[PDB]
Amino acid sequence: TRVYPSKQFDVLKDDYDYVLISSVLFGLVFATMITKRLAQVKLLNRAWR
Amino acid sequence: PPFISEAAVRGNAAVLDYCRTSVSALSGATAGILGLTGLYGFIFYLLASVLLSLLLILKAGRRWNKYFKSRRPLFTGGLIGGLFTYVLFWTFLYGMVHVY
Amino acid sequence: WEEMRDKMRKWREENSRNSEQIVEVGEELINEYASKLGDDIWIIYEQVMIAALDYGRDDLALFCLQELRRQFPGSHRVKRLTGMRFEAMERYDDAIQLYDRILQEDPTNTAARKRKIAIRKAQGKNVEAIRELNEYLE
Amino acid sequence: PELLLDSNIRLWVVLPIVIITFFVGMIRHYVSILLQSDKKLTQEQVSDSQVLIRSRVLRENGKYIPKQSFLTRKYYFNNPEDGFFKKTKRNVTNVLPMILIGGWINMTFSGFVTTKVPFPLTLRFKPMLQQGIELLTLDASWVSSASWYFLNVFGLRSIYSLILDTNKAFKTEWEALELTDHQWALDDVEEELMAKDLHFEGM
Amino acid sequence: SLWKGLVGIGLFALAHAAFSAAQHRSYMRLTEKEDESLPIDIVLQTLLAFAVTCYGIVHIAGEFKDMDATSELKNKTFDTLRNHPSFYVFNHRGRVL
Q1: Which of E21, D181, D95, D12 is nearest to B35 (CA)?
Q2: What 3-state DSSP class applies to D115?
Q3: E29 CA to chain B: closest CA distance, Å?
Q4: C87 and E88: CB-CB below 8 Å?
Q5: Residues with Cβ within 8 Å of residue C52, at least 6 apart in sequence
Q6: Which residues lie on this side of the membrane: Lumenal (chain E)?
Q7: Which residues of C11-34 are buried (b: 16+ CB within 10 A; e: fewer)?
Q8: DSSP 8-state assignment for residue D142
Q9: Residue E92: φ, ψ to 5°
């Protein structure tokens, strides 16, 4: 067998949720595109009030 | 001179910072590549910073005082904000090349 | 090729009213290149309209103004442009009602005063324009 | 560099947090744009500020004009009860969404090591750089993720730039304008001009 | 815009150096030597990449400008100054055409 005196500190977690993390980055990328095209416009409209 | 535009000033400052905060990162990545630890890394920053100043002087031909009134910003410049970035790129490349 | 854009920008920046070249380059750049340019055409419309008024055409005016209307419905600047259109065709009291309205809904708005004064001066009168302009400068 | 670590760690816990912090530092800017308001306060205050600025520039560079004129306006401003100043009478957002996220992370990516810093650190700071580990034998260069996050934060500050009362105020102006010298300062320009030559070689 | 290509070349070469050095490190940890330094070639490559990249980024960084106002007034005349666009009036000869 194998033994782990100190709980295997150099292997990732044996429990990792790889789906949350790929559901987060896309959330942020689309939020960034959103709040890019959503401030350019409000500012332009401030100009031509 | 007596009458100053005060806009070209900020433009020049910006085109300094755009060189400095880049070269900092670059030197950091370089150091993390040819891994060297502790003191020597810091030395490299100073050396790189010095070299940078010289190039600016060679781009501002003849020290010309129409751009700047004093060469101090070329030497000192933004030098602390360059530090953390150097650190980060150093660490990134070290942790990315030698450990793994 | 984009030089045309920068020349138009130049003439916008250092006011260089000649309204002969402007309308030409405008009507050239008012075409499909619009969608290429991107969110920048509107100024070019506000600039071509006036030079056109200066050239005498008045036909391109309403096209540019209605584009502006459809994009910026509750604007104030396009209202000023409608006042301009009015006073070119010599509807003065209508324009005055307009300017007094968009000053009435926005007291701290200058352009309306500075068009009321252009109207007062286009009639021929000067002496009242001067005191109006000083009351403004006050 | 004595250890050998899983590459999956590099892939799935390191790059995520050199990304997240970057996009959050962008979003903070864009949202700050979308947030700020702007008053329409009053005609009175704007006019008063404008005249105060006229006074400022008068005191500053009112020395390129005839003396009598400077003194005339100075009188129109200082003259007792005619002078204009004698007739008119009347962080958290930054820090917090950065400190709330470190907690999430250290609650999520806890039970393992991330990377090494190539400069030796002090030992007392160990128990808060690792935060999951039960070795208490490592040098402190071997860190957890949270430290990588904070390092990234401080390291990417400088790389967004590269990619992107009334009456008392009046009276203080009056008092600071009482003591003032015209100093016309144009009274040798003639000689100075016709001293060496005329200079123009761009025709 | 050749300086852009110069900078991209510096970057590519630097990345090649990093890859070479990582795999060399793996060789080291595999043969359990852990005594020797890096080969010269990698060092020279990365250093030249660094220098070249700086020399190019200085150029493409932008361009300086004078801080004497009247420099940009040398070429200017009344015709620009006089127009006052917010006081325009059209009851003039042009309306004939």
Answers
A1: E21
A2: strand
A3: 10
A4: no
A5: C19, C23, C26, C58, C60, C61, C64
A6: 20-40
A7: beeeeebebeebbebbeebbeeee
A8: E
A9: -145, -175
